[model samples]
Target: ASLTEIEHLVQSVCKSYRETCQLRLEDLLRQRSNIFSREEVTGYQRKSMWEMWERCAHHLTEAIQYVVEFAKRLSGFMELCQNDQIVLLKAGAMEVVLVRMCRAYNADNRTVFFEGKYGGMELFRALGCSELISSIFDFSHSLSALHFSEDEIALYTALVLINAHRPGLQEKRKVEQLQYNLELAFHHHLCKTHRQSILAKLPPKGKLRSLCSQHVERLQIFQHL
Candidate 1:
């Protein structure tokens, strides 16, 4: 009876995933059509005009849809793990998968249409926050037992705070806040040995300067989408 109940619950959850995926697909398709049709251009020019749009559309239709399907199957397997801790772990795994998928999509395309409509600094902040959340889920097992080194915990906690506040800040303010958080995170978590290695990769100071140096201006082009 317990097994049957678990199976039934899993089925319900799978159905939910399917339904949500369908709705998301529908919404995306509708938006794609509306935007694509409004354009008068055609052929290579049109393709050039809408390359990012097409890439995102493909990612949503292909990769993310598959992720949902895989998650459904994974959930069924994890149903046997009925303990609260295990369930939380499973949830974290799912979040990590989703986050990785999103990150990969961003890496391949380097654009989120809405991001450009806003600002480059804001966009990077958003993307970084997303990856940070994924990191949390991926590291949830370590977090569960509080077994992480102080530095690791501090870094994750800083990420959480950054993600929570990133959307609300302006370009300059966001960069300042991000720098502050990174400094706090690194100082608390990273030892003297790892400090130079990490700092070497960080973006330089100043919002516009950092954005220009990093070639992050392309993010602003997405605003038209």
Candidate 2:
């Protein structure tokens, strides 16, 4: 099947998102651990620390724009009523941040370097963090290993926000239809010409259970953040 232009565009943008993230962090590569309490960020006095903080604002804006553009590219996204669009954008913003940070949650070194800093477990603690970040890191690692195509992720991102069920949506049914369409499209994309089986494969019991746990954890992170 020829990839839809929307899919192609989404894939391109997502690719750019990942690429720019790497380049940003690559700008301040740490040869070794810069371990310390979060308060001591100023004490380190390394130009990298504040610069990393400064870039945090830029990265935040970049992530928001990426998702906003993503929703716009999705067919029918703009068809929603003005209020509906605002609701989706507001809800989607939170979900996108979680997905965006997954790219930098380095489980190998056990660090949460979402921006450009290699702040391992201690840094997480110092920032009044939770293990949720680590779970995200692990989830991100799993997601990376799966290596779903860009279109798949694009559809998934679409499904993510719509399913969020932003309270007080004017056109709730329309939003639901959009979610169903995205899910169906990606389902087809995933199983092109493949036969449906009575029971599809499952990754692992433990993994699935942990994923559910993390789903709740993710909601918690959203509330706290």
Candidate 3:
């Protein structure tokens, strides 16, 4: 692909991130009525069960909305066999959610900045996740220390969504090539750039794999509860 074409795709990816994330955040933050009924918080009840369920409902919505927006933004997603796309998106969704949340994390404060927020480890024992939250925050802090720029973050995000090589993918090589192009575009950005690497190393793509493991464990807890 031409440099111009790659840039356009990057721009499109970032645009969709804002369109889906920011707009969804705006709704999450501002619209009280839009609150989900299952886990919805009403009248400041502050009950453990209420807050737990509210949060569960809230994060569930957040993850689903985030996935929906993410799939809509892929530059070449529609070109894939529809079944392949579904498999890839399902496999990719958890890690993508982790990365996006980390991308928006406020390291110093140890809080997720989804524009609208959902947390209070102070009293979430019913969910049985005190230590898990701590680990997530620790990981987020480490990731944030890298201080990735918006475009750099966009590149990581695009790669994460595509490189899954999800089970049942009919066009395996095509997604692989797209992943290769993403890495190539990153290399192009660093072309002849001497030893001046702002990002000391690639995003440690392995981090997503590790995080996905945690996501699976958490989901089991979600299932039982």
Number of the top lDDT candidate:
3
Model 1 alpha-carbon miss at residue 141, Å: 31
The true-structure Cα RMSD of candidate 1 reads: 17.2
lDDT of 2 by residue, 92-131 (tens): 6656555545455454565665433566644434323246
How many clashing pairs in candidate 2?
0
Q: Which parts of model 3 are misplaced by more than 4 Å? A: 23-54, 113-125, 190-203
* TM, every model: 0.24, 0.58, 0.73
Better of 1 and 2 by lDDT: 2
RMSD (Å) per prediction: 17.2, 7.2, 5.8
Candidate rank order under lDDT = 3, 2, 1
Q: Ten consecutive residues with minimal summed lDDT in candidate 1? A: 112-121
Per-residue lDDT of model 1, residues 102-137, tens digit only: 221222122222311211112323233344334333
Task: Indicate which candidate wins on TM-score.
Answer: 3
- Per the 3 Å backbone cut-off, how many clashing residue pairs does candidate 1 have? 2
Q: Rate the local accuracy (lDDT) of all candidates.
A: 0.34, 0.55, 0.62
Query: What TM-score does model 2 achieve against the real structure?
Result: 0.58
Q: What's the lDDT of the predicted structure labeled candidate 2?
A: 0.55
Cα lDDT of model 1 overall? 0.34
Error of 1 at 38 (Å): 33
